[PDB]
Amino acid sequence: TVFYTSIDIGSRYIKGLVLGKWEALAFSSVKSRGLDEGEIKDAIAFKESVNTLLKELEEQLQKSLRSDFVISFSSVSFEREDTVIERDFGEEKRSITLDILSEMQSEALEKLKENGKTPLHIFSKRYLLDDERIVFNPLDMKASKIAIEYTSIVVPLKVYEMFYNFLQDTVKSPFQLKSSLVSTAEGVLTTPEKDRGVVVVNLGYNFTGLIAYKNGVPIKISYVPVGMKHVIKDVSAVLDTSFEESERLIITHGNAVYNDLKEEEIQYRGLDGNTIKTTTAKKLSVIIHARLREIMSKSKKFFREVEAKIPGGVVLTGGGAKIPRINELATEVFKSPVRTGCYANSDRPSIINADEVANDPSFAAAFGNVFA
């Protein structure tokens, strides 16, 4: 029996998941505090938020957290970096062993720790034997020379150290850090999607994350500096209300498509928290639609830069992917197939007791942290 605690640190919500080997033993989402635009700006609040999630997970389990932690976070600074490692055995041929591959990968990882960056994910991209033979798997093959191309997802050391130091002071356990955007993709994509080509659009809070896979590995990673925070801001601005009332309206009555909406008055509070004001579901959706249209139009540039290096279409993830009919809007903007990403619609076996979270695009990274 083996247990995993997976935490996904977002700017608006911190998601937690305990899995046992498959079943879900515990899961929760708590308000994220102290993170402002991917930077920890209040370590005291941040630690409180994390502790609140840990306490809720323990409360559900009725047992102290004894597992390996895998913890993911979002940053605009993740980027793709490649390197090649070679072995030259001389005038004799040698078997390519696990020890040799382990050694070469360890060496790649050490090589990617440079220019102020550090790798969080590494993938073997190409294998070349004896300077001419391309193979899919080098193991047990004999060769005089081997060259392996690796592609990785790296992050600035300063960003890494920020999260690592605070977490090791709060999570009382060994842990590994990952990219939430990479884990999201790993949590939702099918193998054929990752092979033939597919783009994940993660509709997160501060920004919209963008990652493309082809041939089983990430080929491009970027972002648009517009996210659900700006959708909430627009509503607060237009309806003249608080951030939290705006968020309530969007979650409760929002739609990505407004043209066919029935007349429907909806009430909300002013900044004073008492004055009752009224708008319509249609007007609310127009405000949302416009900002969502902006997000997708801007993401199209990425889509086109990838469209040079898309069978699998677009997979939307993150909190924004839950806005009713957003897939319709996306299909119209991207001019390609679009689907909602969640663990359940990946190509993997159902998980006991995961009904509520396996179908939630918000928990994609939490699952992906584990099933990588």
């Binding site: 627009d234 405000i287 249209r293």
Partner: peptide
């Protein structure tokens, strides 16, 4: 920042 609704000229629906 100007809300997208204005920048997309959909404010007539408000």
């Amino acid at each position: 920042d100007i809300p997208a609704i204005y920048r997309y000229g959909l404010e007539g629906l408000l």
